[PDB]
Symmetry: D3
Subunit: 151 residues, 6 copies
């Protein structure tokens, strides 16, 4: 009866994201990854799906419009997202307060695992496009598609 | 089957704390407030209890030793605490990472309601001891005991 | 003989902005709101004017070029702006130091009211464009024009 | 008719503090330095007085109890203080919001001059006690008393 | 046998940048300024060169691709860059951790001199384009080219 | 001819500290660990020594008085320390600027390895005293003495 939505662009999903999914899935009856660029929509979904097969209570959905409308429509009960820094917290803070104001929807933040603290979709992509190896920071389903898109 | 522990000294509990309790209680099957100074242990418990009677799935317990041992002993599944600022986040971040490392216990943070952003037990107490009125920032059960302790 | 300039794009002005105007107007003989996008220039001015009729010592002006040149030309004596977060402070800090260096013009910062901490023109607009209700965060003169522009 | 209180322990006053006093005195009809340890009360007052003789609209007073009660009793209209960092801002933010809540008293912050950014009474004292020369960071009236107290 | 690379766009180089170069050159056998817009490549190089003639162990090079590949190719041993704020630190932190992960290359940060804390290439340019005088914040070789480009 | 001092209380030294020592030793001809409580002086030295035998150009010394006097007396050329967060940076920033002002001594900061980001002597000790296992966060020479001191 509890449910969390983990929203993001996931372009592509990273091992930091999967860590958040696993931790959300352990505390909520259901988790919905809402995908809201380098990869098109279908690629993003497949990469998330392929990376979370070990999470039976998690489902992946494409989202549109406000996250809070997605949460309330799904009958979900909260938003969960990962935080790395105090500056992450301050921007996500404003968004969470706003979401609470407009829809009554709450947001729970989880601290990133230390080993993924410096990993983001954006930085991974910029490094990859310049010839660096980020394969230890991404799930293999992403690594596969990444190599192909840069081959 | 889900359970969150909200730990703190609660000396005294504030309306910011109660806001966190209510939001935890809405997402978890059970919430345990763990009380770990101006008020003695018994006063703190009573004040928390008196302020949370509208929360049927919440219980108040005195705690001792590491929070993570309390969580695992209670068969609880997570720690929940409130955050006001980016500097709060960085100190609580270190603690959460440490707790995750030593016990595998996860921590979910919730952004304070905007109207309670500047309220803390410490600041409330210092202002109260100097003759200021913080009654709109504390539950009435606390206000009652506070007036008595300063009368 | 004292005068503060409150500069910004005010696109649109928010209740957080009006709170700053009121607090500036209480401490300075004169306040000049300098307007420096969703709404054109004329709309922005009218919205500010319509929202500050209760402030007799405040005037609204369109500005061009550096804020400090506007301040010195108006014979004003300081810049006043609102701050919500430590990350706001660091960017505005650099600007204030720069303005002090180049023109000798000082900047006074005021902490946002807690209830408007998460409100900004940008976030209000993004939420509004996606169908969310931000009417409690904006003056009615803005709400009127906003509904019209989204109707 | 405008008036600012600049409160602090001023133990001892630094050139960063005097910079704030000068900037407050330029924008307000009156400035009251409220002194609220290494130096006793009388030394602190004299050092502030001796360092601000070039500020005719500034007076120095010993304060007791809440700053906001001092402000309202003096018929003053605002608190002014200096800020160096984003972490300064977050602690002073909580205090300013609290002061606004309890007494309606507003706080204006001013960014430190870059050359005094790293100067505080505490750090100056610790360095001085260990044999370092901080004379370029303090007014001469303080330097005089400091040498004597360490001779 | 020690060597530091100081990378950046240097568009244009500022006195804050030169301060970093001087401090790097004092601790490392060799310093390589790697230039990676208002000024074209050739102008940027000349401005850096013209501003560092007093630094015999420093050389200026145009760079391409990842900074860490430049470092390893030059047989250099570290990256050095200046930091002004805690928010600078958090973004540069992520980059440094990433660079360490992908290439084993370390990054040493140096705190800006207080008098250049508010100076950046970007802010200097925006102020200059609007008619402000930033000549005390830039080397004369830059000031010369700047006046010409705005004349 | 280059030399860095890594100062601290090292009570006890952690694997985060050793990571900093190794990275300093790779860039400087010589590294001096300056030890400036749970463990007495002799224990601290031995623990540092025992944990750095793989670093031939590093020596351990007890220090007294200002770090900058130690640096200049040793004919060393810089201070090196580790940073974990933006709030670490702001406090260490003030100290570095002060040290630069009083002695001309520069400070180079290094970002902690991600896996040791949450580790500090203080937090390790508090967790250890409460029965938690921090052995993966400390060198074995420290773990040995720690077990003994808690047995
Ligand atoms: O969609 C919203 O709810 C929303 C609300 C206020 C302001 C902007 C937005 C967005 O456009 C948005 C888009 C994607 C994401 C995401 O990460 O998928 C998020 N997000 O905050 O998580 C937000
Ligand atoms: O007890 C611990 O778990 C712990 C772990 C590492 C370091 C210090 C401690 C504490 O002494 C502590 C005491 C009270 C609280 C609380 O707020 O009740 C918390 N707390 O972090 O929530 C922590
Ligand atoms: O105009 C300046 O003074 C200035 C100076 C240095 C760098 C950029 C600028 C701007 O383009 C600017 C534009 C609008 C505003 C505003 O908010 O209206 C502000 N502002 O900082 O307040 C600044
Ligand atoms: O006195 C108060 O107003 C107050 C209010 C809430 C919490 C603590 C206090 C203090 O004990 C205090 C003492 C000295 C100063 C100062 O710097 O002189 C300040 N101060 O914040 O400026 C505050
Ligand atoms: O080039 C990289 O190494 C790199 C790595 C990861 C992500 C982005 C990049 C960049 O595009 C980049 C470009 C210029 C600079 C610079 O300032 O010259 C830097 N820089 O971080 O210093 C980085
Ligand atoms: O000793 C100084 O240089 C100093 C200067 C200004 C203010 C305080 C101090 C200290 O008491 C101090 C003590 C130990 C350490 C350390 O960590 O060993 C450091 N430290 O900053 O590294 C500083």
């Amino acid at each position: 009866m509890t449910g969390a939505v983990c929203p993001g662009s996931f372009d592509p999903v990273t091992l930091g994201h999967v860590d958040i999914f696993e931790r959300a899935a352990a505390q909520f009856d259901e988790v919905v990854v809402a995908i809201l660029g380098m990869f098109d929509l279908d690629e993003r979904i497949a990469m998330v799906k392929e990376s979370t097969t070990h999470l039976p209570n998690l489902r992946v959905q494409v989202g549109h419009g406000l996250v809070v409308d997605f949460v309330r429509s799904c009958g979900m009960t909260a938003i969960v997202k990962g935080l790395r820094t105090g500056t992450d917290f301050e921007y996500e803070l404003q968004m969470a307060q706003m979401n609470k104001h407009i829809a009554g929807v709450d947001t729970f933040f989880v601290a990133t695992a230390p080993r993924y603290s410096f990993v983001s979709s954006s930085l991974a992509k910029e490094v990859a496009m310049l010839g660096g190896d980020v394969s230890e920071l991404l799930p293999e389903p992403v690594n596969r598609r990444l190599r192909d898109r840069l081959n």
